[PDB]
A paper describes a structure:
CRISPR-associated transposons (CASTs) are mobile genetic elements that co-opted CRISPR-Cas systems for RNA-guided transposition. TnsB transposases belong to the retroviral integrase superfamily with an RNase H fold catalytic domain and a DDE active site motif. TnsB associates with the left and right ends of the transposon and catalyses their cleavage generating free 3′-hydroxyl groups, which are later used in a nucleophilic attack downstream of the target sequence.
To comprehend how shTnsB facilitates RNA-guided transposition in the CAST V-K system, we determine the structure of the shTnsB-DNA complex captured after the strand-transfer reaction by single-particle cryo-EM at 2.46 Å resolution. The structure reveals an entangled architecture of the shTnsB protein around the DNA building a pseudo-symmetrical assembly in which the four subunits of shTnsB can be grouped in two different conformations. The protein is found in two different conformations to associate with the STC DNA and build the complex. shTnsB1 and 2 depict an extended conformation along the branched nucleic acid structure, where we could not observe the OD and CTD domains. The DDE pockets of shTnsB3 and 4 do not contact the DNA and the catalytic residues of these subunits are not properly positioned for the cleavage reaction. E321 is 6 Å away, as the structure is captured in the post-catalytic state. The distances of the extra density to D205, D287 and the backbone phosphates suggest that the density could be assigned to the H2O molecule generated after the 3′-OH attack of one of the strands of the transposable element to the target DNA.
Numbering used by the authors:
A (entry chain DP1): 196 to 287, 295 to 311, 321 to 339, 354 to 524
B (entry chain CP1): 196 to 287, 294 to 311, 323 to 339, 353 to 522
C (entry chain AP1), D (entry chain BP1): 31 to 475
Amino acid sequence: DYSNHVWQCDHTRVDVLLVDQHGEILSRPWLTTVIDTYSRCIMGINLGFDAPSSGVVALALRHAILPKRYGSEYKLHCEWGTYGKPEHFYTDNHLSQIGAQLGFVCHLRERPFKTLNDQLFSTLPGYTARLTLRELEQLLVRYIVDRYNQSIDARMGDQTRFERWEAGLPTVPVPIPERDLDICLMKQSRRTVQRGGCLQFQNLMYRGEYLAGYAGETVNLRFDPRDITTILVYRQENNQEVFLTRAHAQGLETEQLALDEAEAASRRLRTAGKTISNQSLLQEVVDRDALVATKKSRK
Amino acid sequence: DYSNHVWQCDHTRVDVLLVDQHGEILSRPWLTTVIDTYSRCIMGINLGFDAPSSGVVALALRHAILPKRYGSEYKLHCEWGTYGKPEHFYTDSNHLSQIGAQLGFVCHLRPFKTLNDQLFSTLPGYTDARLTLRELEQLLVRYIVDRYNQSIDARMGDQTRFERWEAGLPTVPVPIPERDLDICLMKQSRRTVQRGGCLQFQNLMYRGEYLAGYAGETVNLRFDPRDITTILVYRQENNQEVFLTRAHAQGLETEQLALDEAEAASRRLRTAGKTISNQSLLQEVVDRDALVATKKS
Amino acid sequence: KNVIATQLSEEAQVKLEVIQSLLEPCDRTTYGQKLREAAEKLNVSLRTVQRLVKNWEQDGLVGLTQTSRADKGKHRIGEFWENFITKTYKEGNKGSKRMTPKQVALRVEAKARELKDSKPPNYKTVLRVLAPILEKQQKAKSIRSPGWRGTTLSVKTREGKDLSVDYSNHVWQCDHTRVDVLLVDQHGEILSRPWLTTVIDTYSRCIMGINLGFDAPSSGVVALALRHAILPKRYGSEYKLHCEWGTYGKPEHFYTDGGKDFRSNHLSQIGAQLGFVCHLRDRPSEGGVVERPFKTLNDQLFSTLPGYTGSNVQERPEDAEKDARLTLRELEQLLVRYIVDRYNQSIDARMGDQTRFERWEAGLPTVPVPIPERDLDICLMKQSRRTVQRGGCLQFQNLMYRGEYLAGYAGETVNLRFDPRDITTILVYRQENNQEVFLTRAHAQ
Amino acid sequence: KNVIATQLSEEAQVKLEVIQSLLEPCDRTTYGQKLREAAEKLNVSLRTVQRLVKNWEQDGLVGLTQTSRADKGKHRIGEFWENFITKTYKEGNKGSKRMTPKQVALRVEAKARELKDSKPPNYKTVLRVLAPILEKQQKAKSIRSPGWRGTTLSVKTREGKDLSVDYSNHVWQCDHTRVDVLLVDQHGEILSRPWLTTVIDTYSRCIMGINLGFDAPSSGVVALALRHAILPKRYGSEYKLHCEWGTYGKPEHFYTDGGKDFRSNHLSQIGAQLGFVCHLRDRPSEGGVVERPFKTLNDQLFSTLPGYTGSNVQERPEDAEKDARLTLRELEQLLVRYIVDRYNQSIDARMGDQTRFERWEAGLPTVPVPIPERDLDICLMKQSRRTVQRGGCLQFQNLMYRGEYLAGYAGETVNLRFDPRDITTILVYRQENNQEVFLTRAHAQ
DNA sequence: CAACGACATATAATTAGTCACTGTACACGTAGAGACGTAGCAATGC
DNA sequence: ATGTACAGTGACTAATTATATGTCGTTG
DNA sequence: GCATTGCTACGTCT
DNA sequence: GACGACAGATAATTTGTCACTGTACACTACGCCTTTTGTGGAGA
DNA sequence: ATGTACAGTGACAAATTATCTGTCGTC
DNA sequence: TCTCCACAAAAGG
């Protein structure tokens, strides 16, 4: 009917092979896209190595619902005007939970992946190995915003997808504050808060306000894998978790960090550690065993 | 029909008020009985202070299925020769269903006045409480094996009810070994084993053969509350419990001991402990606190 | 010889639910119809439920739950590697050498590169292999002893016999401990932790008497404790006692460990004079009756006191030194009040209906006659053998003194009993038959 | 600010299913049908479902499950008894005293007797009231420290300033430990546990040098370890080293604790001569670069040795004295091979990509030229100040002395330096224009 | 023909006591060893 | 047959409140 | 006297 | 409607990975004390 | 902003047997 | 050539 209506979610295996910062190969990423029904507009996206599951569709839905602020590094001359909450969320134990928590109806039942592949993905060098996930998602955002939302679908009028979506709003939907969508984020269950209110997450130290008093306790973690520079701390009661604070990563060489980059750094450090030889240590332990074997007791 | 075809189990509260061996006034017991419906003959009884639950029904069924042997203290004239397993069983969670499946019969989840008239009314404390659990059980067993089972029913009366049961059995039933009835027994969990193969149960020490190697481990106890001199020890394997041995009580001054008697002994010891005054204890505590506070500097 | 199924596994619970329809007696046609109808209950074939009923018939309620795989608890690393790991742990933990699973994994890697095996067992695999051994060691280290029950009791001895305890003064136990309270002199300066020598009846578990002091366990300290436990008790108003320590009497036996103070010649003479035999204990746990109460004193009296050092150095507070405030006198008053008003009036654990003092008083075969102080003091006196020079003037520990009726036996070796606190006056005996009689005293002049 | 419902029960799951069935938009006439269908399938009234949907919309999935009652965590005994129990426990555990909850219950009983109260809180109630305090205390004592991350690092000094560690041989940490291994002399006889003085570079965590010996920590032992660290390391074939201990040079800062050997004027001499600025640590945790290697040495090397006494009395094996078989020389061989082959070759855990030795060598600002080992020995010499009389009559350490150039220089206080290992020959210096010069090796007679 | 407050009955969730069981310390045990700087004093040559 | 025994705990019961829950009556 | 040279002990730190 | 052969098919174990965390490193028992059992110097 | 790291562990993916589960066959 | 009276060493707690 009107714009904010049935939202469709589909899963696609993106055929652009990717590498990390240091060059080690990584599997082909997945794409999960939310798309409007009244328009053919891409509602929100999620690109990552994680296979289809409740978490990835939840993240894509959170992206679709929320207003989108993108940095100047994206070179976006057009702003993305997507926001709001749908009446239905036809997609595909957990998704119904967010459906009841936000108000929409989730269903476990014309995918736009073909044009994405034929206009953007084929151009990429690793099309089926020189692109990281960050560059892929930058190009994907470029294509979705500047080349897809601005595609006047003549079969659906002389107006473009974004303005067709905008004209279909009964009224401006008041955006949901981001906190009420932490249910859609990824979870780390048990995390020990250390002295001074710090957390050790993905081989990084995270510090946040109101956390010094929780030293020695255990807290939950809610994070967005696209940007783990800020993570959410939740304290577990009998049947609920309450927001506690935001934790920020320290010692970051760059202002932006994703889960993939942290995993890549950990992988590089682990490989560097494993590349160190061990023959000398084994010879030493063997010779110490031999030396203690020859020596006599007080008999 | 025939004998051992359908069994019915019903509960009642005996109007007799019972007391322990030390004289303390207890509550009124619960009587559970199993009846061979085709013969209306008493199958098994469970006389105790526990409210009717799955465990009491299981204990009554265990009494009914197994062959009956009673000591000379019961003063029995006839012998309770009724045994065998039923093809059906009627009684008032899933425990009974599991027991029936294990023992090979169907359990369905839905004669008190004739005992209350000529036995319970006669007995002391009916509706002066002077009878104990053991004495009341002895009287009930003597009455059942000597009068009710040896009685003649109002209809088709030509032989005793026990004789009607015996003639109505298509084939003599092969006895079920006692161990296979352990599913119906009372269960205690997480019982530690001590040095030499010993464990504590109802404030008593139980030495068990072939138990020394399990010292420091945890075992499960199965026991008959009517006779807790010998209890049965089981090993838990997170999916099943396997029999180990029979543990025997030590230091007992009597060859027979029931759960109620052990509970009464523990109650007597607890009361005798409680009558020990502790005014000196509290006075010493408060003056010690005063003395340490005096030295504070 | 039997198995009982527990924790019925709700999948296996509905499996039991279906197996109860096949149990009802029926003819072939409806039995097969309900077989097929129950096949769709759990979405299986008909051969599967045939096997189900066969297994339930064979094994009962335990056939409804899938049995564990036969490889559970075993390891696929090979028999050689398993034996190597176990033997390396066993030998590396022999004696004082302590060897962790990580060291076992390191040696596994060393042997693997020796044997050119490209897949050594992992450290996690080593931990999994060695977990049963550590678990059984922990179980062995946490063994509970049932202890004695009832009134019958005996104490094992190094000689191998069992010393029966049957009367209220048959066997007395005495042992030493260092009190966990740092004491203080009259000024406010730390002296030391005192020594607690306790005398306790074995039959009644009542505290016969105590010795609290700064002197180390010696024959004299054991003699002081024995004197306290034998003599009637009298305490002034400073001990705000509500009850009385109505405890006294000789023992017939004396049960102690192998300390030099208890194996001394002085203790032998003490026993031969007071008519009790001293005995040894093979293990310290055999003297548990005298050895547990120390803990009871720590958990109820010493832990409450301003100066307190804990059980060992691992639990010792850092505040113990600067929190020390109690003198020996105050600590001994508190201790005596605790024993008289709490410990002796407390219930004997095995009995459950009698206090320790009630058990002691009731169990006395006869009311013992109090022993005069002088006789007992003479009995517990250190003694040796010495002779007398010409004109008397017997010399003792670099001191000399003479009395009367001494020169007449110059050249005869005689016994010499004295108190090692007032050496100025000593007792000179004389063996004048097969009997030994009080010759005289040697007093300082 | 935000509340999320998790770990909801199976009943909560069926309620979630019914709320999902109740969420599809529809009309009053057909909405009410599924409303009463929800009431029937929940076997409750329709208004119960009305309340369910109301709380679900006003709270989310949190309102789906029943909220815990307000008395959860509250105590029905009363605020007065709450405060009395808490205050008694807090006061009785203040200082070296330790009051258990049982004693708090005893005091509660005594106070109730004094207050003529026939309903005091039970001991189980006292345990329940005091459980949060005990859990909070345990959590307080079990707090983990994040530690430093990355390459940047600073060490806090007792002076309050933060000293930056920037490159190799910038800050050196030296500390003493009592080795947990018993040693024997020739022919077999235990002597003691040796002292281990370790000096390690802070920027690289590489062990610069060690001193293992029975002599107690002292300015001399620190000087020996300093000489070992500064001088190039050469070891014979008896140490079956595979790698090379190529660590050497002089540091510019010396970060040690407040030990008397480290605050000594002898160490101040070493700093003034070689060019140190010795620093103190406010807390032991501020010297963790030098304490953790002790734990690593105990875990990986010292625990596998025959004569081993764990770093405790509680963890000490009973076989340590009888298992003690190694010598000081063999222990030094094993320790040096462990350091050269295993420790310095191991990964600096802070970085994770380079060895401690490789970090040390790569972090060198300029490759240093070693001391010719004679100037260094002179640098690590005990100093004093003596007066030369009668043309040279030095009497230092009650020994005669006379130099060759000491005749005329017999009226000035001469600086004196020496090595305590050999008092036979000494060194004498002047003090002219804030300078010094060597006169003669004043020999002994 | 369904939302919103009372309401007063009824579960039922929460705590306060009971009481048999069990782990575990009691078993001689850190204030002492050793070193170093800072006072006092004494031997002692002028 | 047997070490000792007390502090703390687990499982259960009883007392104690705090909401859940099926009507009555107003509200659109 | 008066200044060195030895002691001993005591506080303090590990 | 009972069983066994016989061949994929689940799925239940073990095995290995790696990020995270608990906790010991912070000088610490072999020494103190006692008592018997030689063995050897002052005296008779 | 920051004590120091190593044994040990939780959660999980990968590898590997081992019972399981459908079909035929003969009852 | 015995008796006092020191030492030291072994062995328990």
